[PDB]
């Protein structure tokens, strides 16, 4: 295993990567759900979170940790605030920590109506006092239809599994010391009751939780450990677990087979570039079932190339493989759901995920500001800034997915931590969606509201983008000739040009540079956006 | 006149400003329209511009400059290109210059379907060879419904009236040497035929042309000439011409009457701050007629304050009164249309325009990064960056318009060259619209497509904006505590907070920092957006 | 009052400054102390804070809010952490909020052994839930000798009195909604028992609390309100209250009487420069009693002059009058203590405080990088950077205090928010002390450890500083000719050169640029350092 791997020159380093792989390939979330109608014990710690109306309801006096101190906490909580206390509750002996959090009063049209953001903030703050081996009970007052946003909001708010604090290096950088037990007021996960005529079950919410958290792990892991060879070995194990076809083009194979864009970007790095694609044909696909290809930026580290980033922009480029992991782990959850019941993604015939893997490293073998590169699609590109490497590798990615597979997709989802312009456009919680079909734009926005992985449209206007990418000696450049030329859209437009001409349906580009991480680290963004988006028709 | 004015200490300077005022108060466009069915002569220069289909039609052999060289030019023009020639045409003796331009093949959903951008590029390039006193005939092949976009596209593409080249200073910086004669293939302006059941007539298109070009003049004029006292004198003359009510709050009157935000911003400048508001009650208002208030950033020069801008960001801050002029000149055109026929803006009862006038100047009396200012609305503001001055003055503007007039608006339109984040968001041709009502957002986008003054939504999410404006000692700051916090929306949100609580309908903020100008200078952006937006219901 | 003042041209602005003055001239802290042996009621909110040993002692079961939930909180608190709960306690009806905070386990030689920093962090976090008109009880487990550090640590951690949130502008920017009641385990304040043979009484701790908080108010107030004329009017009222001599040199009087350094710095500003000095002869001075002059940088706003600071370095220059306020409010407390008992500062004959008041403003009348200025001391200075304005004004300050008063000081204390080099040197909690006498250095360090206003020596080496201030055409420059030339010491050395030759005892320069403020704003730093320093012999 450690000897199979073509990675480092070192037994010790290789032995520890073999363990890191395991923690990734057998990963399980540390979230459980319990049917509110079957609560018989109460955890060492309890969080209660909901709309102020719902918290003050008499329906809550049933919950098994109700008692006078808790009742008092409910008199004192105001919209947006928190009240915390110890209490002697039945359902436990001794004292129990109860934290009570009201969600905010007002929500706007562009935000998730269940307020999954506040749920995450409230969860995170309750986990801080949970001791090794204990459980945090999370009591959520959210209406039926909110299950996936809750599963996401909680999963992503748990203490992160990647750490090296206090010796964890010796245990594969993996810590899952505590545990979250979700108790929703709605029972739809347990009854399979239909909401907007769709059902989502408990085994699915676990698959989401596992996938969101695997996503936080891969993102959070530094590139000294999660490089392109390791990331690829992981993808292989998930391939053999799920029983799916896998296509890998690696290193010189990229250049030999004409993927000049991604080979150029990753040619300098210690460990080489890969296009890795996993795909499943659904055996229970219905007559109407569409085909879906997904593509993600797997830049394991972005140093900037020769357009080397400064120190303060370069940290966190750990996370520049976020788009990649979002769609990779969404693939896993979707396929897992497909294997659970005949009907679950019945309207999907083929699903494909393409990982565009590479480190953008700086050195003699670096692609230069001025190099001219011939992408797989045939289009020639004049590299003006080597730090716009995402565009390029993704260009070869989307061409592979649209023009080299044995089925033609009917929709292409591009996901990438692409640009800082994104943050200026749409802030740090909403991804930027650059979409060639108004209906697919609306639908992605909506899957964002339902999922709690928010989204917002950015300018789609190829005629205007075309005219800031003009090169004197190639088909296009890879950065615009002007400042303040709608920077996130320009990133999408670049990638759009490399779609095989045989592909005729929507191209949906999700730029999630800022939403992919926050103070605590990786958010898992993307995993639940895609699950929703694909689940809804 | 020159002695009435409380401006400079100088007879000469004051004599020349009196002339500059005149050129502004009697301004007329230099655009005419001629009914295509009544063309009897052909101009020294001719431009033909349209969709390639429409150009190659046999319908064109009728135009009075048809001849073999022209026919040949039509064989050679390809989509997007230009062909130019001299020809002996009947309708003139001697040779005539004919330029033939095909509009582009493909347009996207976010752009004007008539391609008013290409029309403007094509016009501009034909005007360059027109000699003093001559006429350029502009033959446009555009379908009925495109009249306002054409009037705009052409008006704004003429050589600019503000110049000091070759002695023009002695003629009030005003040059209108040539003239454009528009000949559209559609006759709807001349027949009053209904399109989508609305009619627009020739006297209206002239009012638009005049207003777009007055807008380019005011914007283009430097602040050594167009300062707040002069800009105010102009607004007064237009008030007395159109017979409307005018309210001016000036200098110490602002501070005495509680407009701390705008008084703070402009207190350092040579010439003082003004809130200037013009308003008309429509005598022919129908039963349903709504009320409309408009507000614009009139920062005549933005030096940055003490957060002084560098040299290269500071040039063109001439144009930082663009939002102001767009809505001011839209007011003029709208009111002019109202005075033309009983029915023309029948669904509008009251219209108001508020100019937020001030120079952001640097000096001892400057408002500081740390000053705390009490806006008219009562909300206290902690100034962290004095270069976000637009927010502030506009804050007092919208409060005046929503809370101090003798009618309550049902819609507030805020227009401002507000932020560079705008350019990063939505490029240099599309304004950023920050809108509190999804229907009003869609409607503004649409008035942009019909008008050729383009637009694109930006994130509306006050819950997320609220949390980056937190101050420890005031209600809010005036810049966000984070980079990449959706910068254009944050600008709108700041202004939104100062709306009087009595105002209950949509707030539509248009951030047009980049679309307000291009290489040649001021575009007139805003004038035709607002005309369309208000004309459609 | 509002008409006496030579300030603004405005009745409204002047009426509100008259009220701001009042809030400053009648200021009282909102801290009280209660003898632990006489606690009969318990407040709505309670904080318990101490060393873990002391918290777990059985001595605590007596406190009137002891009960089982509280007992449980004490089992759970670990060194450095916090535990919070509601409880039914006797001493109150209903529920009471109890927060329990353990101070940190380990302290180093350069920090206050009572850990006044953690006390402040713990207080601040308990005040956040206290409602209008309520009381927070603060139970501190600290040994006798810690009274002044506690009075300081708590006073400075209260919610700040300067605010404009929610209409406070209409109530003079003054909010004191809640109240803190300190209950120390030691009774030395109440018994007058001697510690290291010195006693400190309750009326003194109140005078400290009042002075620390007046200091936070003056600092926190922006310069649009707290300018040099207002700051001077305040100093006058405190002069007439305390019955002390006052000398003011203002505006042209500075230049006429030879104070070129400070007149130069402040000549550009809206409101003019002042040297303001307050001084008391102690009627109960003992035979040995020394004389003490104090001097502080009162730069009410530092824009940088023509060496204009960028936006992000310029905010918080509100606080550039911190050194000034520290020593001003220390003067008040000391004098107040003197008036309380015959013996209290018996070893002090004369005390003097000199405020070096000015705004460093940018404009035509600005002192330039290249101007040569003749300080009061006769020494000529070549201004190379106008943003090193503190040095200069303080130079005239120390000369006044050492050479123009009717007594000669035996020690000069210079206090100033002088340099950013300070932060690089000694961090954000320790001031930099540049001291001409090793014994006075040690003593100031020690008054810092006892007071909780920390301190740390910086390089004293005039022979090395002399050689980086060489000018070709003046006695010295005002900034060093080299980067990384011990920047905080160089600031002190500049000021040292302007001491009158008649002054022969120690010069102690305290550079407190970073310790003067934190996230929440002004810390009051300086007030309690000086009280301690002077109290100890
Ligand atoms: C033109 C540079 C390439 C655009 C894409 C990069 C983001 C990136 O590195 N993707 O791989 C970017 O936006 N970088 C930001 C950026 O805009 N930069 C980089 C240096 C200055 C400024 C120039 O646009 C930083 C500051 C977050
Ligand atoms: C935070 C500054 C205030 C935001 C608004 C200004 C635009 C403005 O001056 N309006 O009056 C801006 O975006 N300025 C741009 C900008 O973003 N700046 C200014 C200096 C660096 C950078 C900081 O955001 C420039 C470069 C076009
Ligand atoms: C040489 C400048 C004058 C030294 C004193 C100033 C602090 C000050 O302004 N006092 O009134 C300083 O240290 N400023 C800092 C500083 O060191 N600067 C200012 C700009 C760059 C750098 C140069 O030393 C800033 C960044 C906190
Ligand atoms: Mn990247
Ligand atoms: Mn990059
Ligand atoms: Mn501006
Ligand atoms: Mn500005
Ligand atoms: Mn200073
Ligand atoms: Mn300075």
Author numbering:
A (entry chain A), B (entry chain A), C (entry chain A): 3 to 539
Text from the published report:
Leucine aminopeptidase (LAP) is found in all kingdoms of life and catalyzes the metal-dependent hydrolysis of the N-terminal amino acid residue of peptide or amino acyl substrates.
LmLAP-A crystallized under many different conditions, forming hexagonal plate-like crystals, one of which, grown in the presence of actinonin, diffracted to 2.5 Å and was in space group P321. The secondary structure elements and their positions in LmLAP-A are nearly identical to those in TbLAP-A, with the exceptions of β1, β3, and β4, which are shortened, and α2, which is replaced by a loop. The N terminus of LmLAP-A is extended and forms a loop before the start of the α1 helix. For both the TbLAP-A and LmLAP-A complexes, the electron density was sufficient to model the ligand, albeit with less than 100% occupancy. Superposition of the active sites including the actinonin molecules reveals the high similarity of the conformations actinonin adopts, with the only difference being in the hydroxymethyl-pyrrolidine moiety, which forms a hydrogen bond in TbLAP-A but not in LmLAP-A, where it is bent away from the corresponding residue (A424).
